Enzyme design. Structure first.
Site, PDB file in Angstrom:
ATOM      1  N   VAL A  20      -2.377  -7.336  -8.886  1.00 46.83           N
ATOM      2  CA  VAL A  20      -1.017  -7.628  -8.480  1.00 46.83           C
ATOM      3  C   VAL A  20      -1.021  -8.213  -7.075  1.00 46.83           C
ATOM      4  O   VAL A  20      -0.205  -9.071  -6.744  1.00 46.83           O
ATOM      5  CB  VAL A  20      -0.137  -6.343  -8.569  1.00 46.83           C
ATOM      6  CG1 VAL A  20       0.609  -6.071  -7.276  1.00 46.83           C
ATOM      7  CG2 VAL A  20       0.819  -6.442  -9.749  1.00 46.83           C
ATOM      8  N   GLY A  23      -3.909  -4.764  -0.573  1.00 47.46           N
ATOM      9  CA  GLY A  23      -3.356  -3.845   0.400  1.00 47.46           C
ATOM     10  C   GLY A  23      -4.361  -3.605   1.505  1.00 47.46           C
ATOM     11  O   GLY A  23      -5.393  -4.272   1.566  1.00 47.46           O
ATOM     12  N   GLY A  26      -8.030  -2.195   0.310  1.00 48.41           N
ATOM     13  CA  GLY A  26      -8.019  -1.981  -1.126  1.00 48.41           C
ATOM     14  C   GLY A  26      -7.237  -3.031  -1.897  1.00 48.41           C
ATOM     15  O   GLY A  26      -6.412  -3.754  -1.331  1.00 48.41           O
ATOM     16  N   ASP A 142       3.060  -2.073   9.692  1.00 43.68           N
ATOM     17  CA  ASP A 142       2.781  -3.260   8.893  1.00 43.68           C
ATOM     18  C   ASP A 142       4.037  -3.767   8.177  1.00 43.68           C
ATOM     19  O   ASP A 142       3.972  -4.229   7.034  1.00 43.68           O
ATOM     20  CB  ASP A 142       1.664  -2.960   7.886  1.00 43.68           C
ATOM     21  CG  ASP A 142       0.879  -4.205   7.485  1.00 43.68           C
ATOM     22  OD1 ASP A 142       1.058  -5.269   8.123  1.00 43.68           O
ATOM     23  OD2 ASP A 142       0.076  -4.112   6.527  1.00 43.68           O
TER      24      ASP A 142
END
Ligand SMILES: COc1ccc(C#N)cc1-c1ccnc(Nc2ccc(N3CCOCC3)c(OC)c2)c1
Length: 282
Positions: A20, A23, A26, A142
């Site tokens: 998708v 991050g 990861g 973030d």
């Protein structure tokens, strides 16, 4: 607080469907609760004695501080075991936001800009999320378009507590330079970031985006506070941007007073706005 050593294998509980995005440290998957079929987002991270206490810290916050409408809900944590001395995979599992990020929303809107009315709805939701985190002394660190996500009902959710590289959304006080040797994050830095993503929504990109990340990084502390270049925007919106983007963090509004800014509070056509958003998702 979560014990890594107590996490079960994800086998038969969740399964990965497709990639998708990415991050912090990861990759991120559209996942599925195998038994029921319910969709979920799954962040997969290699895990090491090195990375563990940072990884463990990301898990604890998602689990502790996601009981709130504007923070993507924690579902669980798992460890896919794997022979030593090798890396195990950790699966951090959270609710799936089917509509994708605000950054995706921008890309598929005409001209890569959004109605002010949409921007105001979204900014209020982020602020509300931030407030909940700041109340529990958590800094997000973030805040950007990619980390602001939408459910199929156009509910707004914050994700990725992994930082809790790219310079464009960074507040001046966060940038360690000659005059600011010990740059540290504080709650207010999230509010600068929010102002930047507001511009991102209105213009498709953050300021200084055409420049190399290393020169953006150098310019942000020196240059005056960014503004909307078009003046088609209301004076309530331009004022909201000026409030977020106060360079001196001490002179920058707190989260709670930014929540009371007219641009945030003066929102008629609200369930109407989400309906348009919800419709624009398909
Ligand atoms: C970037 O997203 C994340 C980043 C970090 C972390 C963490 N920790 C979590 C998420 C996350 C959380 C909840 N739901 C989603 N869902 C989702 C996100 C993005 C898309 N894309 C795919 C392609 O471009 C168009 C839309 C999507 O398509 C249907 C669904 C993602």
């Amino acid at each position: 607080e979560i014990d890594l050593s107590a996490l079960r294998d994800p086998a038969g509980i969740f399964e990965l469907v497709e990639l998708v995005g990415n991050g912090t440290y990861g990759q991120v998957y559209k996942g599925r609760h195998v038994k029921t079929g319910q969709l979920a987002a799954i962040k997969v991270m290699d895990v090491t004695g090195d990375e563990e206490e940072e990884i463990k810290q990301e898990i604890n916050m998602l689990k502790k501080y996601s009981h709130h409408r504007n923070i993507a809900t924690y579902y669980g944590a798992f460890i896919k075991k794997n022979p030593p001395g090798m890396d195990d995979q950790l699966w951090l599992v959270m609710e799936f936001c089917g509509a994708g990020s605000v950054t995706d929303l921008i890309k598929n809107t005409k001209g890569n800009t959004l109605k002010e009315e949409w921007i105001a709805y979204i900014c209020r939701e982020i602020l509300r999320g931030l407030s909940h985190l700041h109340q529990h002394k958590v800094i997000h660190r973030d805040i950007k378009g990619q980390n602001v996500l939408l459910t199929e009902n156009a509910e707004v959710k914050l994700v990725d507590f992994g930082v809790s590289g790219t310079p464009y959304w960074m507040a001046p006080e966060v940038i360690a330079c000659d005059e600011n040797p010990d740059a540290t994050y504080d709650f207010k830095s999230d509010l600068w970031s929010l102002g930047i993503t507001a511009i991102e929504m209105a213009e498709g990109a953050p300021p200084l985006c055409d420049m190399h990340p290393m020169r953006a990084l150098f310019l942000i502390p020196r240059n005056p506070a960014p503004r909307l270049k078009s003046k088609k925007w209301s004076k309530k919106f331009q004022s909201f941007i000026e409030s977020c983007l106060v360079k001196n963090h001490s002179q920058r509004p707190a989260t709670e007073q930014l929540m009371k800014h007219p641009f945030i509070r003066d929102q008629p056509n609200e369930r109407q706005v989400r309906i348009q958003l919800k419709d624009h998702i398909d």
